[PDB]
Structure 1
Amino acid sequence: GAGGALFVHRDTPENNPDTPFDFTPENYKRIEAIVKNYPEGHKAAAVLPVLDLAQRQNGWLPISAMNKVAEILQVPPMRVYEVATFYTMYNRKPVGKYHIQVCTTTPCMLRNSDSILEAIQKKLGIKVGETTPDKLFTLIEVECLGACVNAPMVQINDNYYEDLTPKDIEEIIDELKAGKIPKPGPRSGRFSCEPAGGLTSLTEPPKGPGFGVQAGL
């Protein structure tokens, strides 16, 4: 329904302009590499990646991180605030160590996405917006993630876990708690976007180079 997240900023002892943030030297090298991609005179184009890089170092985006990005790129801070509040992958609040994002759009909802949602809720004891007290997990619902064929699917810190069943998501959560990482991809003996059984197409050996080249080439 409603977003729930606020789009104004009020200073807090844990998030103020004086909150310590600064890029590591390796992150500065990466910033130089990012900036060099765009034409000179248009450095502001680096706002989107560099900001993300900040989130990749700190975990979320405090107001001081946005100020640092604005100062580095010589862009007015309100532009960086606009970018941070527009795009949904930017975390303007601290999240858990594992950000669980389950898709609930119609193609995923048709293949029983609600079952995955309730299984996660009952395994973790948290709702669709909260963080576990251990600060290891944060569960939210998201729109289509581009893996509709593999519904139901979830995303955890740049990993897709697809073809989910309640037991499957429970075991993935158990593996993530125990200090291991789970293998991404389909979880039903598919490991592809292929038909679940039979491989109706793409069975012949691939043709070699120059098989169908036209005359005069």
Structure 2
Amino acid sequence: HIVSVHRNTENNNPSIPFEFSPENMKRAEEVIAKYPPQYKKAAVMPLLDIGQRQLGYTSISVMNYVAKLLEMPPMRVYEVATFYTMYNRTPMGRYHLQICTTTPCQLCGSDGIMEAVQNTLNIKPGETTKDNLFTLSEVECLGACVNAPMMAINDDYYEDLTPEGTVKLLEDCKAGKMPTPGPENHVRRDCEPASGQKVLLSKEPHNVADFLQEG
């Protein structure tokens, strides 16, 4: 599940080098400046993020190198990126399937979504695709509970899915050049009711300037 012991066979070494890209190095200096000059260790969370942006995953080399950068022993970086779900320490493909399985997705049919996805592919929810394109991951509540069945490609949540409509998006991502705009299949804007807008049916705001406390 979490699995925490690191295997030292190949492509994960302290010996294989890693350096920041200069845009990434400039952004790293900018993020270290957000915190007091004492507690520059507090910038360990959003900076292995930068390592997750440049390299496809979080190697042992990026954690060693960010530990070198921030004046830390390496185990204090090791604990932080072990405790978190979102630092994937294994190599994945390009598109990270994050299908939500929590009860609000479940009472509205995330089972059929997952079955359609893993019948289109042949892989397990911890397995990646042999093409190194898709990587399944069942995930818990992504915050889109009203968009009751949903999932997530790498940063973009895709929502309101039907099992027939889902496999379309799967081959859309498989073919290369077909993402959706970011929301669902155009059934609503962001979170309104599906029939329509019941309330806030005004073309203009009413100001707070006439509605003041006076003291």
Q: Percent identity?
A: 55
| Alignment match of 1:26 (pick from 23, 26, 41) | 23
> What secondary structure does 1:186 align onto?
coil
| Alignment match of 1:137 (pick from 134, 155, 173) | 134
Task: Note the residue ranges of structure 2 that are not aligned, 5 or more in a row.
Answer: none
| Alignment match of 2:3 (pick from 3, 6, 9) | 6
> What secondary structure does 2:10 align onto?
coil
Q: State whether structure 2 residue 146 is matched by structure 1 residue 182.
A: no
> What secondary structure does 1:85 align onto?
helix
| Per-residue deviation, 1:208 | 3.9
| Per-residue deviation, 1:212 | 4.2
Partners of 1:127 and 1:139 within 8 A in 2 = yes
| Per-residue deviation, 1:18 | 1.0
Partners of 1:163 and 1:188 within 8 A in 2 = no
Distance 1:48 1:215 in 2: 43
Distance 1:16 1:154 in 2: 33
| Per-residue deviation, 1:76 | 1.3
Q: List, as ranges, runs of 4+ consecutive aligned residues in structure 1 with deviation greater than 3 Å.
A: 208-212
| Per-residue deviation, 1:150 | 0.2
| Per-residue deviation, 1:206 | 3.4
Q: How many residues align?
A: 214
The one-letter code sitting in structure 1 at the alignment partner of 2:52 is Q
Task: Note the residue ranges of structure 1 that are not aligned, 5 or more in a row.
Answer: none
The alpha-carbon distance between structure 1 residues 143 and 215, as it changes in their structure 2 partners (threshold 3 A), is: closer
In the other structure, the counterpart of 2:211 is 213
In the other structure, the counterpart of 1:105 is 102
Q: TM-score, normalised by structure 1?
A: 0.94
Moved more, 110-119 or 201-210: 201-210
Distance 2:81 2:97 in 1: 20
Partners of 1:105 and 1:144 within 8 A in 2 = yes
The one-letter code sitting in structure 1 at the alignment partner of 2:171 is D
| Alignment match of 2:144 (pick from 140, 143, 147) | 147
The one-letter code sitting in structure 1 at the alignment partner of 2:100 is C
Q: Deviations over 1:170-192 (max 9, x none)?
A: 11111111211222112251131
Partners of 1:176 and 1:182 within 8 A in 2 = no
Q: State whether structure 2 residue 31 is matched by structure 1 residue 43.
A: no
In the other structure, the counterpart of 2:79 is 82
In the other structure, the counterpart of 1:192 is 190
Q: TM-score, normalised by structure 2?
A: 0.95
The alpha-carbon distance between structure 1 residues 58 and 203, as it changes in their structure 2 partners (threshold 3 A), is: same
